[PDB]
């Protein structure tokens, strides 16, 4: 099959591709700026940008099926557009958060337009991505092999990124996932503290866990810049996003058992050395 995965250089896409592939799949890898090692040899780098939907022409012809990296401005447009070149199918990158009800305005818009096109459709809503601790804990952890961390007792369910990418593979490539939006959470309940500590083990070295304030925390992530910065309000419940509930993993689609934050760490415990 003729696939066109968006978000092909991202955490979740550069899984996807490389998986596509070995399957020997016709697989075509949308990117802004079209350089060697966007993709694996063998497929096809397109140029284009999901803001612009005029770009996509060629990068859509001839495509059987469609893996959607989230534009809510545009996504009607470049979904129409999907359909005008034939795409039989799409695959959204969505969030976990539509399923919870929090996110009404950003990945819903794009389900809402994939959904009302006519085409075969699989949204994949990860929840928060164990990508998020490399984000937030990878510079301090490589300046000194400390976290500063305000709810070391707190936690949530992360996800590995390859669960997701497994679960988007199967709905580009298998029948049963059409009209199915998969929630994908980790495995298990982890507090952050914990959460270090699996990093300590991946690494094979200490962490110091410093229990900071929220506020001395947010003047560290507003120093800390990047991804620490940029989310910091939602990150310490400065602002809203918006006993627990049924907690789904990409086991109900893959058949296998959702990998844990301890196999995360290992898988990247190198992009935490100094
Ligand atoms: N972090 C979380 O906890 C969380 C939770 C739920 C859902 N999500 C969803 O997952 C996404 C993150 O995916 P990821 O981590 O795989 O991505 P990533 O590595 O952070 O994202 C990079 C990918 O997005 C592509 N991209 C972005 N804007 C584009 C545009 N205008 N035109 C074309 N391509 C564009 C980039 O292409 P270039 O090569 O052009 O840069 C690149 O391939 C989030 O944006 C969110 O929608 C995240
Ligand atoms: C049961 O879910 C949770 C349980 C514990 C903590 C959490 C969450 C949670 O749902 C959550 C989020 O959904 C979001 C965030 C988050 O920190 C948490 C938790 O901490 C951060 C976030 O707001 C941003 O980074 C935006 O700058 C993105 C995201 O917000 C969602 C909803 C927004 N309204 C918006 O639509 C955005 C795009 O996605
Ligand atoms: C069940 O959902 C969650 C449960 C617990 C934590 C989380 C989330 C969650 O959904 C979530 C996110 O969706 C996003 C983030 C996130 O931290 C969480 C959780 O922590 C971080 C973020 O800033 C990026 O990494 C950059 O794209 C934004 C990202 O999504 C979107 C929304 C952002 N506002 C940003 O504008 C862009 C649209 O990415």
């Given at each position: 099959s003729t696939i066109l995965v968006t978000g092909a250089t991202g955490n979740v896409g550069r899984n996807v591709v490389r998986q596509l592939a070995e399957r020997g799949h016709d697989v075509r890898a949308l990117t802004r700026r079209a350089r060697?090692?966007?993709?694996?040899?063998?497929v096809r780098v397109q140029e284009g940008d999901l803001t612009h939907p005029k770009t996509l022409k060629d990068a859509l012809e001839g495509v059987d099926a469609l893996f959607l990296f989230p534009v809510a401005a545009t996504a009607e447009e470049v979904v129409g557009m999907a359909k005008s070149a034939g795409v039989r199918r799409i695959v959204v990158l969505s969030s976990g958060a539509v399923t919870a009800g929090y996110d009404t305005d950003f990945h819903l818009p794009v389900e809402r337009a994939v959904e009302a096109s006519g085409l075969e459709w699989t949204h994949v809503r990860p929840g928060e991505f164990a990508m998020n601790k490399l984000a937030l804990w990878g510079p301090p952890i490589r300046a000194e092999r400390v976290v500063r961390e305000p709810a070391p007792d707190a936690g949530w369910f992360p996800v590995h990124e390859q669960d997701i990418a497994d679960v988007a593979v199967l709905a580009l490539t298998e029948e049963g996932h059409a009209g199915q939006a998969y929630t994908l959470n980790g495995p298990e309940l982890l507090t952050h503290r914990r959460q270090v500590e699996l990093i300590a083990d991946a690494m094979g070295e200490e962490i110091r866990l410093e229990v900071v304030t929220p506020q001395q925390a947010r003047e560290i992530y507003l120093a800390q810049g990047g991804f620490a910065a940029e989310n910091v309000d939602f990150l310490l419940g400065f602002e809203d996003y918006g006993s627990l509930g049924p907690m789904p993993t990409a086991e109900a689609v893959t058949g296998r058992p959702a990998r844990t934050f301890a196999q995360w760490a290992r898988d990247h415990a190198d992009e935490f050395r100094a």
């Open positions: 060697p090692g966007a993709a694996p040899e063998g």
